[PDB]
Structure formats: structure tokens, C-alpha cells
């Protein structure tokens, strides 16, 4: 189970009572296929976690055995988005990560502990040419952290333990985290260099109309 120490609930952000009465959210044609409308489930996901947009993020997970906390699970794992939200990134890349072969990515295929192959394993036979693609796996010997964008909304994430040598069980979970932070970025057609130039030209025209004002009197 993912830890959820300071849940968006109980703060001045979200209210679990309104969450119960079919709380719903929308997508502004930015995630995947469009205008996605998703109604939150409070029975399963409960009160979401809250993450300020900014600071690379990597979730904390506790492995429970026999109904009690067993330990903080430090094995490798991957994490994905259910709705198709794509406004997130990974801190490390293939070149900087401690990988001796091309790491796998969510793009090729679902993920599992069975089909996972370690990038740390020295294998040159197939990966002769390999670019600095993003690195997906979290935890383990890699210090990767997750980086969100400007959406400012609730993210529903599917976590699956990936290290096959950890346990035979396909340990996995679903959880919800609320990002707070990023604001509208519509700099658009107007830009700062183009804007002092635009405005000061509108200010010389004040002087260009000032010269006849001075010379006609």
C-alpha cells in the first residue's frame, strides 16, 4: 500500500463529503483519446494524496504481511496512469542511468514482473545502438523521481512491483494523488522580447505625436 501521510482531504483543498457525491473531473484535450470526463471513486481510491507540482516525486510503499506492516518495500517497481494522462516525466535517462543495455519502456507493452529484464545485466548482443531514452523503473539502485507538469489535477496511478527476485506474488496497487501548483501558461503569440519592443514603440508614438505638439505651438 502506498503511504498517504498528508492526504488532500483534511486540508483546505478537498472535502471527502463532496468527493462521495460523485466527484468528477475533466481533461482539456491534453491527455489522450480528448475532453475526458471521469467521475472519482471514493469507495476504492479513498482520499487522494497531494503533490505540489514541482519537486521530482517518487511514492513511498509499505509491504504488509499477515495484516500488519512488514517493511518499507525497497524493491524496483513501475508506475503508470489509468486514464491516459501524459503530463509527467522521469528524472533519469538511459544514458545517465546505470544500464548496460536498452531499458524497456511502457510503450512496447501490460507490464509485469515476469516479462521484466534487467538493464543492469551486461547484454550487448541485441542492443548495439541505444539512445538516452527515458528510464521508467523506480526504486532499487536507481535514484529516479517523477516530475509533473502544469495540469493541477488528480492523477490515478497503477503501481506494480517489477523485481522478480523479490517475491513470487504480482504485488500491485491503485491509488490517487492530487497535484497542486502549475498555472495557465498562455504566453501565446505575445512574448517578452516582442512585448517591450511593442510597448516602447507605442511610447515613442507618444513622443512622435509630441514633436508636432511642441512645434505647432
Amino acid at each position: 500500500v502506498v503511504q498517504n501521510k498528508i492526504s488532500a482531504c483534511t486540508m483546505g483543498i478537498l472535502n471527502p463529503v463532496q468527493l462521495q457525491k460523485n466527484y468528477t473531473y475533466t481533461i482539456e484535450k491534453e491527455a489522450y483519446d480528448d475532453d475526458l470526463i471521469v467521475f472519482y471513486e471514493y469507495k476504492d481510491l479513498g482520499c487522494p494524496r497531494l503533490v505540489y507540482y514541482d519537486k521530482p516525486w517518487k511514492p513511498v510503499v509499505e509491504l504488509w504481511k499477515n495484516g500488519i506492516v512488514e517493511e518499507i518495500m525497497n524493491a524496483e517497481y513501475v508506475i503508470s496512469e489509468i486514464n491516459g494522462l501524459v503530463t509527467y516525466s522521469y528524472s533519469l535517462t538511459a544514458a545517465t542511468a546505470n544500464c548496460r543495455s536498452q531499458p524497456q519502456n511502457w510503450s512496447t507493452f501490460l507490464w509485469n514482473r515476469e516479462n521484466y529484464v534487467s538493464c543492469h545485466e551486461d547484454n550487448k548482443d541485441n542492443p548495439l545502438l541505444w539512445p538516452n531514452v527515458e528510464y521508467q523503473v523506480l526504486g532499487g539502485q536507481t535514484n529516479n523521481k517523477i516530475i509533473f507538469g502544469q495540469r493541477n489535477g488528480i492523477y490515478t496511478f497503477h503501481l506494480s512491483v517489477v523485481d522478480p527476485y523479490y517475491s513470487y506474488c504480482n504485488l500491485n496497487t491503485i491509488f490517487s494523488v492530487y497535484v497542486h501548483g502549475a498555472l495557465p501558461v498562455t504566453k501565446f503569440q505575445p512574448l517578452l522580447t516582442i512585448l517591450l519592443m511593442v510597448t516602447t514603440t507605442l511610447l515613442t508614438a507618444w513622443l512622435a505625436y509630441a514633436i508636432p505638439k511642441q512645434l505647432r505651438s
Binding site: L195, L196, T200
Partner: protein
Amino acid sequence: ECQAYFRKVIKSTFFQIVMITTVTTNSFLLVLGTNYDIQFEFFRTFEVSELFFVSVYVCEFLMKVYVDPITYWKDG
């Protein structure tokens, strides 16, 4: 000929109150900027106002050194 009228524009009481109101509004918006709620609602207001203010200050500097090449640096 243009320099004389331009210094007369410098001394404009209208210009004095323009600068005073510009700076006061900038400080007020800065104060309102320390609240993410009001930073979110009316964000376009904040953006347009910040660019307006920077334009005003830079035009003031450029034209006030235009009226005077060297002695501008005399004033603290």
C-alpha cells in the same frame, strides 16, 4: 528644440503622478501575488499588469537618460 520640450515632459506633474500610481499598483499586485488562489483566478490580469509595469519603468529609464547623456549618472 525637441530636448527642451522633452525635459518639459520630464517635469510633467502628470508624469509624476503616473509614476507614483504605477509603482503603487505594482506593489499592490505584488501583495496579492502571495496567495495561490488569487494568483490562479485573475492570472491573466497579473501577467498583463507585470508586462505593463516593466514597460513603463524601462521607458522611463530610457527616455530620462535620453534627455541627458552624462549627468543622469550624477543622481543617486
